[PDB]
Design a protein around this ligand. Structure first.
Ligand SMILES: [Mg+2]
Ligand SMILES: [Mg+2]
Length: 133
RNA sequence: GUUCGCGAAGUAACCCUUCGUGGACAUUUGGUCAAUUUGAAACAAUACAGAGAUGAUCAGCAGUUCCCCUGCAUAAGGAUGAACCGUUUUACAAAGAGAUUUA
């Protein structure tokens, strides 16, 4: 196991030595987050995604891959109440509204999208969103 | 222990000693800390490594880090003080062509 244990120790010093000097570079935050997903450790992986939302919270390719981290392992309520934070942060962004719709379409409960489009039409989006409703 | 009053004793022109009693006066220090190995100075020596850029040899000054030492120091030095010069795949589709395939 120490073939793996000092492996996991050595890799975490290499990415966090880099992110120490570059709080930016959102691509390295995602890559170091994906390393901890493959270690089957979602407690550490959620930390890196929360630490990276502090640096930028408008870089929505970070948001979407944190939803994808939660749905691939099929932890569903952690991706559900995440959306109480995500679209209450950025109500104007299209893709954060669309992805929380289509994921609910594949989970097949249309009572939930009956209240989503209720707010999302009270919010007055524009032509491409009203037509999908 | 002092002093004021009281009660006696002995000496006694009520004075000096001594014993027994009431009140007064004076009133809460210090520790975050126990006296060698097991609750934490450092260096020197030895061994290895070697002090930027570049074809090569050199003056340097910065910035970045959950890096410091010397110095009164917001000065100036400390290899241009040190560590950084590694790794990098999805907001993702539009158009078409073939093939597979089913009411
Ligand atoms: Mg310097
Ligand atoms: Mg200097």
């Amino acid at each position: 196991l120490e073939e793996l244990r000092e492996y996991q120790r050595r890799k975490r010093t290499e990415y966090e030595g880099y992110l120490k000097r570059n709080r930016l570079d959102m691509g390295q935050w995602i890559r170091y987050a994906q390393f901890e997903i493959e270690q089957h450790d979602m407690r550490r992986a959620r930390s890196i995604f929360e630490r990276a939302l502090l640096v930028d919270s408008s870089f929505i390719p970070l948001w979407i891959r944190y939803i994808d981290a939660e749905l691939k392992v099929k932890c569903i309520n952690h991706a559900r109440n995440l959306m109480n934070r995500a679209i209450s942060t950025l109500p104007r962004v299209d893709k954060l509204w669309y992805k929380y719709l289509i994921v609910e379409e594949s989970l097949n409960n249309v009572e939930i999208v009956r209240s989503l489009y209720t707010k999302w039409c009270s919010l007055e989006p524009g032509v491409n969103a009203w037509n999908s409703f």
